[PDB]
Amino acid sequence: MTHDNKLQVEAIKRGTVIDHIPAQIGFKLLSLFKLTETDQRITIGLNLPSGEMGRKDLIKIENTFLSEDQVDQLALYAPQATVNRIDNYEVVGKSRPSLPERIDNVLVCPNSNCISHAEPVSSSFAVRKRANDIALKCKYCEKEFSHNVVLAN
């Protein structure tokens, strides 16, 4: 029980409530983590205001909790985002995300000549917080890339 204010959010008994999603990154996380499979209520607040951070997206899926590496997967796409695990209308589990050591099968190597494209294998990337441009290393071609180059979406 409680009531986070400033603007209008939605009621939830138990379930994950992801808050602080950057602008328009909502419609993305919605499909990048295929959240629309859940046949359970899904609240979604787009362009809501937020102090010095103005408009912010916000997704809410009662009775659903992010899979293990999901929050880790949710680091590259929204660094400042916050995961709130709810139960009994309570924030029983506040969690901030950390960039993991490696991203499996979701990313796609930029090297055209990388054997991963052709052959049947799960792409795997080493995550190196190279100062400020997340460094991404391809497990196969050993090439390294600027996280954004790898990150089209």
Binding site: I115, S116, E119, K139, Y140, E142, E144
Partner: protein, 310 residues
């Protein structure tokens, strides 16, 4: 078991200084003390999905100098991959059920790595995967540098030519960074510079390296002058501007060099080393090639043999 027993030799980034040193010390021993039966009864697949003369023939010659047998294909066009459209994964799988070790050269990067995943317990050796790595080239290089300069420490190595697509110079730097006191002079046309990932590591390592517009400047300062060929088969059309060796070596520029410096080259050499260089006591590309024999013989003995008294 020894350190490299049944291990995959995919990338220099995966080996250690001691590992490298074990190869050369071993190589040294095989070079002066033959072992005709060491690999008797072993069957080694020599799978080249890309052109070769030195790498394939030296390797197979080694297999033979150790009593081993070789089965293989020098063209992927006659296989069932290039005809029936089989995946490489399936090719590596069935083959790993017949042989004892697989030697492979492939057009794309990560090809060797991928095979380790479908080869079961069969060690895979990377004869070159795209423009990523060429480990055995570096083992034969380290041996040539060591036997001519008596050290792998505090050397002055200058690398020239296509440093971007050159898999040989990627494997060589990561190797020479394992040792101490090495200073690297990088001489390349900008569209073909050394990748950033390799440099970042040199920095992380605290290693001195510099850029130069010609050999002339570092010439009377180097110990090793590693020359490379423009990787024509790999250049993007926008790079076609560089298909002509921009920095070529003639006997003339070897005038003020250290009387101990050697000129190495993985070959084949296009037009980057004028023939007159061949008679100067500095030219060492053919003796270098000769060394591939002892380097690979050592690698094969170590990967397939547990204990090895020599």
């Amino acid at each position: 078991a020894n350190p490299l027993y049944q291990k995959h030799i995919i990338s220099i980034n995966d080996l250690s200084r001691d590992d490298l040193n074990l190869v050369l010390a071993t190589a040294a021993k095989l070079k002066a003390n033959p072992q005709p039966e060491l690999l008797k009864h072993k069957v080694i697949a020599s799978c080249f999905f890309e052109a070769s003369t030195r790498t394939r023939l030296s390797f197979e010659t080694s297999m033979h100098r150790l009593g081993a047998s070789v089965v293989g294909f020098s063209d992927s066009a006659n296989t069932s991959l290039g005809k029936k459209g089989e995946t490489l994964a399936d090719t590596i799988s069935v083959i790993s059920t017949y042989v004892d070790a697989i030697v492979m050269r492939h057009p794309q990067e990560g090809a060797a790595r991928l095979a380790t995943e479908f080869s079961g317990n069969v060690p895979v050796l990377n004869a070159g995967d795209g423009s990523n790595q060429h480990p055995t080239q570096t083992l034969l290089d380290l041996f040539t540098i060591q036997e001519t300069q008596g050290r792998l420490d505090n050397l002055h190595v200058a690398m020239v030519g296509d440093l971007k697509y050159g898999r040989t110079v990627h494997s060589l730097t990561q190797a020479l960074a394992k040792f101490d006191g090495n200073r690297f002079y990088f001489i390349a046309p900008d569209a073909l510079a050394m990748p950033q990932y390799i440099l970042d590591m040199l920095d992380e390592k605290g290693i001195a390296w510099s850029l130069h517009s010609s050999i002339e400047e570092v010439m009377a300062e180097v110990d090793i002058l590693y020359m490379t060929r423009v990787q024509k088969e790999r250049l993007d059309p926008s790079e076609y501007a560089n298909v002509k060796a921009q920095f070529v070596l003639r006997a003339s520029d070897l005038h003020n060099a250290k009387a101990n410096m050697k000129v190495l080259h993985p070959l084949a050499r296009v037009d980057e080393i004028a023939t007159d260089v061949d008679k100067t006591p500095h030219a060492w590309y053919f003796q270098q090639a000769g060394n591939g024999i002892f380097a690979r013989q050592a690698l094969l003995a170590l990967v397939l043999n547990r204990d090895l008294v020599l």
